[PDB]
Design a protein around this ligand. Structure first.
Ligand SMILES: [Mg+2]
Ligand SMILES: [Mg+2]
Ligand SMILES: [Mg+2]
Ligand SMILES: [Mg+2]
Ligand SMILES: [Mg+2]
Ligand SMILES: [Mg+2]
Ligand SMILES: [Mg+2]
Ligand SMILES: [Mg+2]
Ligand SMILES: [Mg+2]
Ligand SMILES: [Mg+2]
Ligand SMILES: [Mg+2]
Ligand SMILES: [Mg+2]
Ligand SMILES: [Mg+2]
Ligand SMILES: [Mg+2]
Ligand SMILES: [Mg+2]
Ligand SMILES: [Mg+2]
Ligand SMILES: [Mg+2]
Ligand SMILES: [Zn+2]
Ligand SMILES: [Zn+2]
Lengths: 25, 97, 215, 62, 127, 81
RNA sequence: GGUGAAAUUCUUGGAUUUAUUGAAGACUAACUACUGCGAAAGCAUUUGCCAAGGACGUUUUCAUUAAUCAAGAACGAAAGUUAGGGGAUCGAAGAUGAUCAGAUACCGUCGUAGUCUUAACCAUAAACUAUGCCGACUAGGGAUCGGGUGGUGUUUUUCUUAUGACCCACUCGGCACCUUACGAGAAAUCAAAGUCUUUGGGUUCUGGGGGGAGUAUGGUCGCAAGGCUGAAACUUAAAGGAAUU
């Protein structure tokens, strides 16, 4: 598996998490 | 391991230079990995000269020649094309043959 | 309906200025003169490209092209004026080999007889006799100096008597020779070619000037 | 239209499947022309080869 | 002695043109597009088609007045290929052997002084 | 290379090496007394003169400093002393 | 038109093509190399200017003024974000023809952001020569690039020097090579990756099985996107390097 893709996925997940946190706030 | 002491090609005391688009695949390739065969060819075929000489206005005019510098990039430098693949032993030969 | 363009086409013959050793150059085949849109105002802005080795006969000028614009319309005849002394694409490229430095001088000039012209000078360093150095380069500042000298020479040559004299000078390449003579004392140089000439601005139509290039 | 040329030398044999010969054809009407021709089948030197094609020529077969 | 025409061969990698012009170039004599003669699209870059087109042009022109011909050749470029493709040489041959006299062959391919970003997109065309 | 005397160097070998790299660090420069065509007496000029030089009373250029050495104008006679 | 095939789209409106010019915006081919420059990233129309810089010269001057450096800073490709201009080209999304078992993937056609700028930010790259930097020395050979020296050196001629371009001899500085090992390597390879068991020339900075992981938590820097910093639980006996058949 490619690492760049994995990194991208992780970033996306992080973004999602951030959004969730914001919503909670 | 590194296949070459030159790693890629030519970028020594330089770095991060200028790109060329290829002949057939037209892809962005550095002006070192570029591979430049350089084609010198007379406009007609080798057998299609006598006939021209026979039927022309300007008798004994000779030939014009095309000078086309090819940028046949590493990737599409090989199909049945030039440069081939050399043995890891006999790769340290910079000669034109 | 018949759409064949041979009945509605006129066969004119092209005459070159008195600067060239050959009077007639070719046969322009335009349009048979029909009332409204006549073959006189239809021409003018039509430029014929032709070599010098036919216009002189000498095969020393086998390279380089000459552009001639229509300026004089006569009865079943067209007389032309000079426009663009250009270069053959195959010869300039044959001059360009690896190792030797290409020096390009580019000069904008104004004629004494009121015309805006553009002259290019393509020069090359030469691997002269007894040179072990396989490569044959210049020294950048030297190139600049050469260019400056060429510009000076161009300034000297132009601004002095019409286009008709300039064209004549071009014809057996005297300018090139003079440049070589001048620049031999800075950097060797082979070829030293005038390549391309571009005319930009034409103020008046005139008649006398047109006449003077025929006879 | 009918043309015919004698063969003199064979420029090997080319084809993906193979078999088809590359020949050097010389015209018995004016020997000034020696053309590269595609010939199907067994062919030697000094044979009269009829040609329905007049001027078209090809080398490699792929 | 002879009537001179200008051939202007546009035998790009796909299709041939034998667009025979005047001497200024403003008025065309005959064109006959290379891919018209054969209605097989595989046979457009083919030399045979080009040859046929050239022959047709010769028929139009040699049997009307024009006997001598300067030949300009360009197989596109600038951003495209900058290289003579299949069909130019064949056309030239046809012109020669139909019976027309040759008035100096020359190549006028549009060669840029570095151009716009050409097609492919960095990684380029994938075969 | 077994033994080389790095204390008695030959007159050619030393010349081959530059200035400071020799066993005794000494200048290669010999600065000269000049005999210009105008004046009647000797004047000192450095071989690598840096700036413009005048002879005695009249402002006469002796040497034009370009690169390393000095371009001695016209043609004058000179000794190492 | 287009490709390995065709098919989209444009068309008796004259498309395409052939001239001429004009319009615009980027881009500076061929010369272009085992070459230059720069702290890197970078940089290629010329000529004007405005400063800077190495290298070389140097019987100059100063006199240890130094080397590397956590802090903190200055730059830092491209994409991306803000505005304003510009908007040819190529072209993420987006359409649309195909190909396909299935293409929203490669191929073909158009096409808003963006590319290019003037102001900001951002601070990452396989920012790679994957070789921290400054030193010192050990091996031979040419070849360049830059500046110097000596040629009773050669054609350059305007008589003759004087230049400049050449040729040999040297060096000095730089990018690099080629040849060996006599060293060092785990080897592949290396004139440094050598002087490293005979192990301390100076210094910064990193790593301690693979994964979880550059993740979770904090902190900060950011308009945002993100970057800097950076775990553990658990989890396995391998992951990996170079070579070999
Ligand atoms: Mg550098
Ligand atoms: Mg495209
Ligand atoms: Mg412009
Ligand atoms: Mg350029
Ligand atoms: Mg250079
Ligand atoms: Mg940008
Ligand atoms: Mg589909
Ligand atoms: Mg898509
Ligand atoms: Mg696409
Ligand atoms: Mg468009
Ligand atoms: Mg990093
Ligand atoms: Mg790193
Ligand atoms: Mg002499
Ligand atoms: Mg010099
Ligand atoms: Mg671990
Ligand atoms: Mg965090
Ligand atoms: Mg393993
Ligand atoms: Zn390629
Ligand atoms: Zn005096």
């Amino acid at each position: 598996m490619r690492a760049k893709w994995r990194k991208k996925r992780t970033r996306r997940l992080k973004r999602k998490r951030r959004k969730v946190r914001a919503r909670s706030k | 391991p590194k296949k070459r002491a030159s790693n890629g090609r030519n970028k020594k005391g330089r770095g991060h230079v200028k790109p060329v688009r290829c002949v057939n695949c037209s892809r962005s390739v550095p002006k070192d990995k570029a591979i430049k065969r350089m084609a010198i060819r007379n406009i007609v075929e080798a057998a299609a000269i006598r006939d021209l000489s026979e039927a022309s206005v300007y008798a004994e005019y000779a030939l014009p020649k095309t000078y086309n510098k090819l940028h046949y990039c590493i990737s599409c430098a090989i199909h049945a094309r030039i440069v081939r693949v050399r043995s890891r032993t006999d790769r340290r030969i910079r000669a034109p043959p | 309906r018949v759409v064949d363009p041979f009945t509605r086409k006129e066969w004119y013959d092209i005459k070159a200025p008195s600067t060239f050793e050959n009077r007639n150059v070719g046969k322009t085949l335009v349009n048979k003169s029909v009332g409204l849109k006549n073959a006189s105002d239809s021409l003018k802005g039509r430029v014929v490209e032709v070599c010098l080795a036919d216009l002189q006969g000498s095969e020393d000028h086998s390279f380089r092209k000459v552009k001639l614009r229509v300026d004089e319309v006569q009865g079943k005849n067209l007389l032309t004026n000079f426009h663009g002394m250009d270069f053959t694409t195959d010869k300039l490229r044959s001059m360009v080999r690896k190792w030797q430095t290409l020096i390009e001088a580019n000069v904008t000039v104004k004629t004494s007889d009121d015309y805006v012209l553009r002259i290019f000078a393509i020069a090359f360093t030469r691997k002269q006799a007894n040179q072990v150095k396989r490569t044959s380069y210049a020294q950048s500042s030297h190139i600049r100096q050469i260019r400056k000298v060429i510009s000076e020479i161009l300034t000297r040559e132009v601004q002095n008597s019409t286009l008709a004299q300039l064209t004549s000078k071009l014809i057996p390449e005297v300018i090139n020779k003079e440049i070589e003579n001048a620049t031999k004392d800075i950097f060797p140089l082979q070829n030293v070619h005038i390549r391309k000439v571009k005319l930009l601005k034409q103020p008046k139509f005139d008649l006398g000037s047109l006449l003077s290039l025929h006879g | 239209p009918v043309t015919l040329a004698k063969v003199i030398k064979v420029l090997g044999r080319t084809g993906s499947r193979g078999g088809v010969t590359q020949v050097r054809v010389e015209f018995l009407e004016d020997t000034t022309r020696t053309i590269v021709r595609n010939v199907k089948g067994p062919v030697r030197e000094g044979d009269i080869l009829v040609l329905m094609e007049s001027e078209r020529e090809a080398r490699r077969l792929r | 002695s002879q009537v001179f025409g200008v051939a202007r061969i546009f035998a790009s990698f796909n299709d041939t043109f034998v667009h025979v012009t005047d001497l200024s170039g403003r008025e065309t004599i005959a064109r006959v597009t290379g891919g018209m003669k054969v209605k097989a699209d595989r046979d457009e870059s083919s030399p045979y088609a080009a040859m046929l087109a050239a022959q047709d042009v010769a028929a139009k022109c040699k049997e009307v007045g024009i006997t001598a011909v300067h030949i300009k050749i360009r197989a596109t470029g600038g951003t495209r290929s900058k290289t003579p493709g299949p069909g130019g040489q064949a056309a030239l041959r046809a012109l020669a052997r139909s019976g027309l006299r040759i008035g100096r062959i020359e190549d006028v391919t549009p060669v840029p002084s570095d151009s716009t970003r050409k097609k492919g997109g960095r990684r380029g065309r994938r075969l | 290379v077994l033994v080389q005397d790095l204390l008695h160097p030959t007159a050619a070998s030393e010349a081959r090496k530059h200035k400071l790299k020799t066993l005794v660090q000494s200048p290669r420069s010999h600065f000269l007394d000049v005999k210009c065509p105008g004046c009647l007496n000797i004047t000192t000029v450095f071989s690598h003169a840096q700036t413009a030089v005048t002879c005695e009373s009249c402002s006469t250029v002796l040497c034009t400093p370009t690169g390393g050495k000095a371009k001695l104008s016209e043609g004058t006679s000179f000794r190492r002393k």
